[PDB]
Amino acid sequence: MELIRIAMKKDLENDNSLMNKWATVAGLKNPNPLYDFLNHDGKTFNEFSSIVNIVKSQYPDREYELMKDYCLNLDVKTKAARSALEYADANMFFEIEDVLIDSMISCSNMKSKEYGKVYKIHRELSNSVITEFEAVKRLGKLNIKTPEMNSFSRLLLLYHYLSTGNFSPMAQLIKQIDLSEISENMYIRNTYQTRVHVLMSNIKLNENSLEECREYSKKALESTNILRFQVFSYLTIGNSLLFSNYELAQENFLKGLSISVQNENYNMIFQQALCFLNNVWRKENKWINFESDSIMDLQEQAHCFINFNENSKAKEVLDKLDLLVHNDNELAMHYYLKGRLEQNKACFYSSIEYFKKSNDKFLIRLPLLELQKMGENQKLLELLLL
Amino acid sequence: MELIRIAMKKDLENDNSLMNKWATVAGLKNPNPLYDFLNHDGKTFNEFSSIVNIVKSQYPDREYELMKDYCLNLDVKTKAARSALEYADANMFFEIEDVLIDSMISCSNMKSKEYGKVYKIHRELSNSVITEFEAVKRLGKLNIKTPEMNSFSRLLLLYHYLSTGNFSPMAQLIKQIDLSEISENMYIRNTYQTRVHVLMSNIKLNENSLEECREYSKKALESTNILRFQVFSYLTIGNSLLFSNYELAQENFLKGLSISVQNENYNMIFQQALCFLNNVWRKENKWINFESDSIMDLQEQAHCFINFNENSKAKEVLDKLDLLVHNDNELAMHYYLKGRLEQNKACFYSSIEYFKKSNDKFLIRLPLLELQKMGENQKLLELLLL
DNA sequence: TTGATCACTAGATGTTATTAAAACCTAATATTTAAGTGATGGC
DNA sequence: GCCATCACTTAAATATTAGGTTTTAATAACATCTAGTGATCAA
């Protein structure tokens, strides 16, 4: 017996009004399916949101514990397990996802096998185990039948494009996605709509269409109850304001932090966004992570020191950074910081170069802003953002 | 009997020294395979360069007529037909290519079928009949066996990226290509090496690494006897010099013009390049096409007039142009010309904006060069090329 | 009588098992190639 | 002579075929779901 079923039986003992409340939370017209759920092993809901919405309404702080136990006991050959796979991936519950994938790829239900194989390609691609070319050839070789995996085969590519700064094919590919063709799995259909909204938001951020960016993140927020998408929406909204409005950026990052303070990963993401924000605006910075040796966190240390004319401490931190293997995006920040410290325009030109090499039309604002304050032609600097 | 065989028999009648000359032109140690070629229907050469090199040496002005007749009589189940397919594609002989493809996709030799299907995807992709996504899914579904089609499956993608200005995935993909794995078809192997050189040249041009660009096109030239690659290599070399080195750009364009002035496809290419060159350098310009009413040719007219302070003739030409439907690229030149004529910088900023909207990293050099000559920050202008 | 619990139901959704027909190896068998050899035969 | 022509030839590189898997597609057979119904049992 699954943890969720035991917990629902206990709360029923203490309060016999619950089954009609839970039925409406689950989108059911009467609670007869809930009685069967508690009394009979292996009984699933036709739509996965029935159980997800009860867990979020009744056991919000135990979602992981309960849904992990529930998902990992599911018969992998069912619609419910297919829904669990998307649930796991959307919530970034990767230990759950990878176990589901590994038993779905070997099962004899053809739909579950296809979903499992498609999500495995996504996991392999997002972890740089395979190239984009290899991934899409594998997708073609699968002979995809379901409208669900037809849509996700495009979404997983869009995530790869985003993670590698390859924005130009994104607009055309995202337009091909047709969620209206999905008729079996409404849980997946609705979570994919959320994913589309957040991807559209990130594309607009990249195009520097900042109002549209916010409108898409707001659509994402209205369409979801999933923490991961709420987190990345607030992060995107805040990022879209980072160079123009300290207080509104801060409000979005503090909102994100307040909903995610209990999760170490999301906590640290908002701490890092607040840290970046306070360094951009040259304020005192309580968010600096002196314990990290990652490139990102050391750069913020240096930035804060330079902001306060603590040049030996800044130089110490850059000497530590000189000894590390930077990617192009990392190098661009490195040159921005060296430029601020040494007060040397040449570094800002290299910083801009490396931001252009990493297709970053966002943080490039840092060296552009310095050159603006050094008196360079504003029109040229605006044209460099394009 | 194929036309080439009849022609070779005729020239033998008039001059009985030819078979040993032809054997060495064909890379053969003795001419016994040539005797068999003339005397026995369906006898092919182990390497397709044997026949191609004879045709280019003895019948240079009849290459199309002869090779068309030869290719279209070939048994499509052979190595020779597979070579002919690449020959047709490299030379842009599309009527020949599409007939070969159509009989190869239906034939019962598994290698020819594979080559035929891969080239069909290439033809469909380069004609925008399918998307890149659909193309590579089809490639994966083919289950490619041959090293040749493994390499070409990457090359055909690289061409798509190039034609759509999507340069960022090019460097990573081209590195995966491994020509040393090809052991069967040396004609294909060597033509693909040429193709790699010219793609490398275009990648470097896009990165604004102009010396490297030239080095790759020069390697392409030395590796080929195929007019298409010679043409596009001289065009690229000259284009890489257009804004910086008049005499060298001119020399490359005149070479290109020399080899292509007789040929309807390519003739105009170098006339247009010479026209652009002479307008950039503000010289007398015999290459202006007053007979065209295309937007590009009228813009060149206006440019030449403004270069010589012929302002009423320039205004006449712009009044004609005002009345036409411009795309973004055309608008960018429109603003460049307005800028030169009316002598204000503001127009050069709009010109640059519109070049950036049409992803043109080439003609953008026109307004950048004016701003450079007006004394603006050269580093910023260089950074605008990226 | 309320109301909670639960096993029935029907009809729509989902899942599995059965085929037959395509497709894919692969390894034997057979064919075709380049480049020596030696026969004609016209000078 | 001695040189062009060209059928043999060898062994290496190519092409074909026939077979037995495996893969794929379609659908008939089976099962599970929601949301009504009506039984108990408890006030």
Residue numbers in the entry:
A (entry chain A), B (entry chain B): 1 to 386
Paper text:
Arbitrium communication is mediated by the production and secretion of a hexapeptide (AimP) during lytic cycle. Once internalized, AimP reduces the expression of the negative regulator of lysogeny, AimX, by binding to the transcription factor, AimR, promoting lysogeny.
To understand how AimR binds to its unusual operator sequence, we determined the crystal structure of SPbeta AimR bound to a 43-bp DNA fragment, including the AimR operator characterized here. However, the relative disposition between the TPRN-ter and TPRC-ter subdomains is slightly different from that observed in the apo form, and this is reflected in rmsd differences when monomers from these structures are compared (rmsd from 0.92 to 2.06 Å), confirming the AimR plasticity. As a result of this flexibility, the HTH domain’s disposition changes and the DNA recognition helices α3 increase its separation (1–8 Å) with respect to the apo structures. Similar to other HTH-type DNA binding proteins, the recognition helix α3 from the HTH motif inserts into the DNA major groove.
